[PDB]
Design a binder for this molecule. Structure first.
Ligand SMILES: NC(=O)C1=CN([C@@H]2O[C@H](COP(=O)(O)OP(=O)(O)OC[C@H]3O[C@@H](n4cnc5c(N)ncnc54)[C@H](O)[C@@H]3O)[C@@H](O)[C@H]2O)C=CC1
Ligand SMILES: NC(=O)C1=CN([C@@H]2O[C@H](COP(=O)(O)OP(=O)(O)OC[C@H]3O[C@@H](n4cnc5c(N)ncnc54)[C@H](O)[C@@H]3O)[C@@H](O)[C@H]2O)C=CC1
Ligand SMILES: NC(=O)C1=CN([C@@H]2O[C@H](COP(=O)(O)OP(=O)(O)OC[C@H]3O[C@@H](n4cnc5c(N)ncnc54)[C@H](O)[C@@H]3O)[C@@H](O)[C@H]2O)C=CC1
Ligand SMILES: NC(=O)C1=CN([C@@H]2O[C@H](COP(=O)(O)OP(=O)(O)OC[C@H]3O[C@@H](n4cnc5c(N)ncnc54)[C@H](O)[C@@H]3O)[C@@H](O)[C@H]2O)C=CC1
Ligand SMILES: O=C([O-])CC(=O)C(=O)O
Ligand SMILES: O=C([O-])CC(=O)C(=O)O
Ligand SMILES: O=C([O-])CC(=O)C(=O)O
Ligand SMILES: O=C([O-])CC(=O)C(=O)O
Lengths: 314, 314, 314, 314
């Protein structure tokens, strides 16, 4: 019974994301927006033999019609990295894109859940929050910075190393979504896994730099797209299941947080009909993980401020 | 336990196709091949938290390693249509691509199911079979021209018209995969549907020009990609199920046929452990449908001969 | 002070062609048309320090404006070959394009010189003509099939073999613009050059399949663009000098001709103030060249007919 | 008789750049280099009827042979801006490229004139200089940051406002190549022009942000390509004319400088057979212009520092 909109639906991420969404019996209405190529993408997906009615929308003039009556909005719209770039080098470009798109959501679907994929998530969620404030519709329980791909990677890597089924592995990942702000809580991993500090340090670095590993392997042809489409769909499915009253649905996401001195932080979250039902916090951690959290906060605060500062200048 | 190869994995069809395969618990190994970009696509997909081991291969030297030990090979490689073009206009381009890649399959995984997506299917399948004949390993029960998207479209359109759930609609589609060679047997639809003639005619034509409809909408950005990924994945899963012993798996597909005077033809096929268990044939059709079959045989024969001739001229 | 229009200006040929035209003191107004990207291209060129004013038009609504008051119109618009394709494979797409564009030329700038680059030239010129006849403004002295790249190539290939300065070389080339219809009259080359038969065969072969050797080297990335931008510019410059009144300006081009039983043919044309001043005809040829002319007529006649018969279906 | 190398020859700038170079009798050998597509660009150009011997090279393995015996090396190789990006957001990506290409130049053609187009120019020239210093072959008279397009834009806008022929206009532009650092000395224009302060500030603004405007106009399709090919060809031509002993050849360019407290700076340059013959200096400037210089200096210093610091990390 759910209506989902994808803003940036024509991109590397947008298209496979929209495919996974079209395939799902959770979605009953799928609206697709972009500045380019949307009608062709929409006609393509509309042929798939599932119940979701698909409709494409092109240009800022048609953005309002797209957002009308939306339960959930996902935002891959944005520019991806090239080899060498940091996530921060994309800031100027993506800030503008996010501000414009979130404003429309604020005006035309303020009760919707907003899932921002565009980078850097550490700054673009603050932008989304303030933009919603500036239109007087802010609800911190419905704005999500999608960090799911970090969890998905953590699970895959730990599964590979221990020879486990990655469907049975669950690694909480907290903090933010860039470099050393990504903190894998291997001590909270289910099932429990024992590593020497040797491997545990590499495993942590592997998770932190996984996004850059992929950018290097694509040699200028973009960043993670297919895996991100999987993670983005997974998060939307969790969210939509929770909104149908499924119980015990937990996902980590970058949101408005009380858990630290940082006003935005990613922790595991109990999702429900409200959006965020309850924030489960950092919980019990190892010294090594405590350390990483302390180091990450400086950088996190800078990125949050940078986002709030940008909204002031509109 | 299925080991699947995708040849043309970096393209518009191949990337999302590879994603759907990677997500499936039916696939235990996913080997990807292309002449460009493959290692980035594999890196990206390798991070998804499912059991299938992903491996990328690039260039002719690496093709035999992609194909070794494979149960199924999907071949979406090939040049897509631009607006105005027929599928036949791609022939000279794609004939060489398909001949080369099928020669490699015949050499390195002769016992695999070979699923050709590359257009024009009405000609590229005959090419595939003649290549396997020159290598002395032609098994006509394992070579499939993937027509599944024509069935997926038919199901969607019928359901849209009658207000049904498309998951519950099943339209056999026969003949070939180009214009008037696409023959949707609406009279054999489950559930039985009755349409006034004017609606039945418009529906039948819409199914036939569905691909051309998507090319127009995309305005030179290519042909159907996301829905073709859906259709090819569906077909591969059907094949794998049947290989795992599942009973009553029926899919339409353009194969070696003696149902009409055409050497190749698409009809419903019961699949089993060794590919085609039984060609279920045309069955009983309406006169309208009888007329489209008569009208399609000339074009089909020409396209078959065209393909056979290409392998002759070598 | 010639007013030139480039239809298809955002393309691989269209862009560098537009650069060469912008760079010329002959051009006072450069109007650029395409269905995509034309505003960015126009803005780009408008920064160049030449006097030509640049204006960019987008989509068929703005096509009339683009052609208003034009003296010469260049049509590189169309779709390029991929490896393996013949020029004939592009017929369906490009015939529709040329017919649509030349229809507006005929409506909005009937007096202008019309230079068609879009392949297959052997068919697209007849189309242009039959479209102009249909609007009752056909002037056979103003419609040119741009065969210049053949000449340019021939000059270069002769000069590499005789170690000559290609600037001083002039080989006339007659017939059409596809495979065996391209007839390089080496016997009429200035300066005079003597080759044994085997070298004369291989040289002529090289000239005929040069387009295809470039399509192979580009390996999917399209056909000749830069050298066709050069050849196109040269012809437009030649044409314009004559319109200003320069005496003795001769360029080979594929036009309505009565030299052979083929109703369209390429020969050296003396250009003047009203288009073609005088068709200079074949002239003196060798035995080898008479063999090639006679062998070529059947293929030209067919391509001429395909083009003519296409306009009837409109 | 000059032997020019183009690194990044397959790009949007590189291809038209390479064309203009091939069209000049000043060039005897044009070696083209890229990581992709160069063979097909080379073949395309090799057909043009001018004397330049064209040769394609592909991948870091062939780079050394591209550079042997070269007189001028031009480096447009790099990533262009998207809308909203500053030239400096490209630093991390383009620094690595420039450092690697210039490293090869230092080993294989240390005596050649090095013309860097890659952005951000304010930092890439320092990178080149320091890479050349590491290999003990630094000559500050031979390393140029192509600011030429800034001058070409200044000429054009001034010529539009005063109804002049832009070919008879020269505005010196000084400082650097990014935002406020671009300082067009309108007071030193020839022929003399004077604008009211309100028109003068707007003109100055238009020149400073001209590159960003073309990016805006292209809506994500890249940055200025054709005009940059013009500006870069112009510069190489000036540099080759002077190398042949021509006199009175003056071009602005960002080079090693002591005209200000900036260690690198752009001012008009007298060019001769050793490269830089004489720095002509800033000259007499208005209050408005002197103020812009003062404001600019801290930004240039930072950009220069950024580049130097990068090479210390290798
Ligand atoms: N949070 C995460 O885990 C990850 C985030 N990303 C981010 O996702 C973003 C998108 O990545 P890709 O899809 O690969 O890039 P892409 O370049 O392939 O596509 C971007 C899409 O955004 C669209 N777009 C740009 N401006 C728009 C606007 N104003 N309105 C609507 N659409 C607009 C473009 O038309 C294009 O279709 C990037 O910023 C990337 O950094 C990527 C991977 C993971
Ligand atoms: N049977 C059907 O129902 C349908 C068939 N198609 C066909 O699928 C083919 C691919 O379409 P798209 O993926 O959209 O095109 P695309 O251009 O996006 O991708 C083509 C892929 O084939 C690869 N390729 C080209 N030559 C190759 C070679 N020699 N060896 C290995 N790979 C090679 C390219 O590198 C690229 O990865 C086309 O022929 C298209 O007409 C498309 C839709 C439906
Ligand atoms: N006669 C000759 O010697 C040569 C002819 N050609 C031909 O030139 C044509 C174009 O080649 P490229 O520029 O390389 O192709 P391209 O694909 O790079 O660009 C073609 C341009 O035409 C435009 N276009 C497509 N449909 C249009 C329409 N309906 N109305 C207006 N514009 C439209 C496209 O948007 C694009 O800007 C091809 O047919 C190619 O075969 C190429 C080389 C030599
Ligand atoms: N100084 C100026 O006035 C201007 C500078 N630019 C700069 O020019 C540069 C190139 O721009 P475009 O050609 O339009 O972009 P593009 O993407 O069209 O060109 C990229 C080219 O660089 C090549 N490349 C990338 N890495 C390479 C490497 N490691 N080795 C060899 N080639 C490599 C690519 O293969 C491609 O051929 C950009 O940095 C852009 O910001 C653009 C306009 C004006
Ligand atoms: O690295 C990028 O640009 C995209 C990203 O966040 C990831 O892949 O995790
Ligand atoms: O039309 C194309 O090129 C692809 C195709 O076969 C379809 O969409 O049915
Ligand atoms: O091959 C093509 O499409 C373009 C052509 O006619 C040539 O390059 O001579
Ligand atoms: O803006 C860019 O990226 C290229 C540039 O420097 C210009 O056009 O002046």
């Amino acid at each position: 019974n759910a209506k989902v909109a994808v803003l940036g639906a024509s991109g590397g991420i947008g298209q496979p994301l929209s495919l996974l969404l079209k395939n799902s019996p959770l979605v009953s209405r799928l609206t697709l927006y972009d500045i380019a190529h949307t009608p062709g993408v929409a006609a393509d997906l509309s042929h798939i033999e599932t119940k979701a009615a698909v409709k494409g929308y092109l240009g800022p003039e048609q953005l309002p019609d797209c957002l009308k009556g939306c339960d959930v909005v996902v935002i891959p719209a944005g520019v991806p990295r090239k080899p060498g770039m940091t996530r921060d080098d994309l800031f100027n470009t993506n800030a503008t894109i996010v501000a414009t798109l979130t404003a429309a959501c604020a005006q035309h679907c303020p009760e919707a859940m907003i899932c921002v994929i565009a980078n850097p998530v550490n700054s673009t969620i603050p932008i989304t929050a303030e933009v919603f404030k500036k239109h007087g519709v802010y609800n911190p329980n419905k704005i999500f910075g999608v960090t799911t791909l970090d969890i998905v990677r953590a699970n895959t890597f730990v599964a590979e190393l221990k020879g486990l089924d990655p469907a049975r592995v669950n690694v909480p990942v907290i903090g933010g979504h860039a470099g050393k702000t990504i903190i894998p809580l291997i001590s909270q991993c289910t099932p429990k896994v024992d590593f020497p500090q040797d491997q545990l340090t590499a495993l942590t670095g592997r998770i932190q730099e996984a996004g850059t590993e992929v950018v290097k392997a694509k040699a200028g042809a973009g960043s993670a797209t297919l895996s991100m489409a999987y993670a983005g769909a997974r998060f939307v499915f969790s969210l939509v299941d929770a909104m149908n009253g499924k119980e015990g649905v937990v996902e980590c996401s970058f949101v408005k947080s009380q858990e630290t001195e940082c006003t935005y932080f990613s922790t595991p979250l109990l999702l429900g009909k409200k959006g965020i039902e309850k924030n489960l916090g950092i919980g019990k951690v190892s010294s090594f993980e405590e350390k990483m959290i302390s180091d990450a906060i400086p950088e996190l605060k800078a990125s949050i401020k940078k986002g709030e500062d940008f909204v002031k200048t509109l």
